[PDB]
Every structure is written in structure tokens, then in C-alpha cells.
Design a protein around this ligand. Structure first.
Ligand SMILES: O=P(O)(O)O[C@@H]1[C@H](O)[C@H](O)[C@@H](OP(=O)(O)O)[C@H](OP(=O)(O)O)[C@H]1O
Ligand SMILES: O=P(O)(O)O[C@@H]1[C@H](O)[C@H](O)[C@@H](OP(=O)(O)O)[C@H](OP(=O)(O)O)[C@H]1O
Lengths: 127, 127
């Protein structure tokens, strides 16, 4: 309900959604574009909206990330709860692929993600 | 200190700064792009920063308004209280021109502004 920041355990980057739809991670907590709004769709399914960008994170058919102005089926992810309050987000459309960030803060392509990676674990935090 | 919205008396529009630098007015409080940050430069001088856009309101030489990624001398305005709790913001660079919004929510060119207009009167409010 409240806004969130998703803190990636793989180097501690907050998942960031830019006004133009680019997706990446940054460490600066005061960054306005890491303020996200998670919305329940079905049980355990969420969309992830950049509040400032007013766009929905989308997993593309080639494993790229791009935030969409309009919701599509590419914008829904399974939220699975994991160890020490960390969540994973798996594309509903491309069911082997996760939202993920590299240790550099560049996001990790879905094709290269998988269970157990540090890259896919995000901790929701307050805003 | 805290973020603010500038509520314009000329039709009740909140001043909005878009990521691409466009400036306009909208009535929806929940619009993420009406969260502004006012920063004092000199006494009674301010810059006006769109928080989500991360850009500074600038008055241009032809009276256009456009939000700057970088601060320049066009980004400073004299903040003066007039009327009944409503402020005016007068360009330091183009000293006869004010920040202003039309009754439609399109912003009014600085060349067409002047003291006593409703278009130039803004009430700072909380965010
Ligand atoms: O390797 P590059 O030159 O950076 O370009 C890659 C991709 O083709 C996109 O152009 C870019 O945006 P999206 O993939 O998000 O659409 C993204 O940038 P980034 O991952 O470095 O942020 C990269 O995945
Ligand atoms: O903005 P949206 O709603 O996400 O829509 C576009 C579309 O979904 C495609 O997947 C892709 O272009 P093509 O597949 O036609 O090449 C592009 O992503 P990309 O540029 O980040 O790869 C997106 O802009």
C-alpha cells in the first residue's frame, strides 16, 4: 500500500525506474526514482510502478527490462518470500526470468537470472 | 526545508514540472510532479526544483518556462508575499516577469505577466 524501495542484496542497490523507462540500480536512498509502488493483482502477483516515472516495470521477450507507461501482461511478477525478509520477483509472462541487478548496478538480463542468485533478492523498505 | 506544492489562485492549479522540462498546472494533488523543492539562495530569493523531474524551474529570455537539469541564473526568483498568504515568484534575470499559470492550466508567458494578476499568485502547501 505505502510506497517502497526494493534494496538488492547483490551490492545494495535500490532498484530505480527512470522517467524514460530505463531500469537500473543506485545506492543513493534519496534518489526520487527508487520510490516504487507495489500493487497486488492476484494472490502473490504484483506489478512494480516507479512513482516518479509513473511507469510499470516490464520484462521484455528478450529478457530486457523496460518500464511501460501502460500496464501489460509483461508487468506482472510472482512475489516469493525468502530468507530474512527478502523477496524475489519472477516474470508471469516469461516464467524462468527474474527482476535482478548486477553487482555494478546495471540490471541483469532475465535470461541470465535464476533461483539462489544474489542478483534476484530484493528487500522492500520504507520510503 | 520540506517539499511543497505551489497552489495557483488562478483556477486552482498546482504548478507541475515534467521530466522532459515542460511546465504546466494540474489540479490532481496526487500527481507526483507537483512535489517541488524551494531552496533559498539569497534572502527572499529561491530556486524551484521539481523533485521527481530533478530539474530547476527556469524563466527563459522570451518569457517561456522550462525546467533545467542544471541550475543557471535563470533559475532564481524573488519570493514575495502579497495578497492573503499567496506568494509571487519574480525572475531575477528578467525582472519584470513572473512565474504564472493561466486559468486553463497552461503556463502564462512571462512577457504577459504583471503585479496583481491572479495568474502570478501561488500558495505554498505541504507535500
Ligand atoms: O549494453 P548497453 O549499451 O548498456 O544497452 C543494453 C540495451 O540494449 C538497452 O539499450 C539499454 O536499455 P534497456 O535494456 O533497459 O532497455 C540497457 O542499458 P543498461 O542495462 O546498461 O542500463 C542495456 O541492457
Ligand atoms: O514501452 P513498452 O511498453 O515496454 O513497449 C516496447 C515493446 O514491449 C518491446 O518489447 C520493445 O520493442 P521491440 O520488441 O519491438 O524491439 C521495447 O523494449 P526495449 O526497447 O527496452 O527492448 C518496448 O519499448
Amino acid at each position: 500500500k505505502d510506497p517502497k524501495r526494493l534494496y538488492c542484496k547483490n551490492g545494495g542497490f535500490f532498484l530505480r525506474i527512470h522517467p524514460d523507462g530505463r531500469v537500473d540500480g543506485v545506492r543513493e536512498k534519496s534518489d526520487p526514482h527508487i520510490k516504487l509502488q507495489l500493487q497486488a493483482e492476484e494472490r502473490g502477483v504484483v506489478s512494480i510502478k516507479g512513482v516518479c516515472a509513473n511507469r510499470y516495470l516490464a520484462m521484455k521477450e528478450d529478457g530486457r527490462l523496460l518500464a511501460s507507461k501502460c500496464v501489460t501482461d509483461e508487468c506482472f511478477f510472482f512475489e516469493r518470500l525468502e530468507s530474512n525478509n527478502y523477496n524475489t520477483y519472477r516474470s508471469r509472462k516469461y516464467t524462468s526470468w527474474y527482476v535482478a541487478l548486477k553487482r555494478t548496478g546495471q540490471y541483469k538480463l532475465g535470461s541470465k537470472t535464476g533461483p539462489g542468485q544474489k542478483a534476484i533478492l530484493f528487500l522492500p523498505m520504507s520510503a
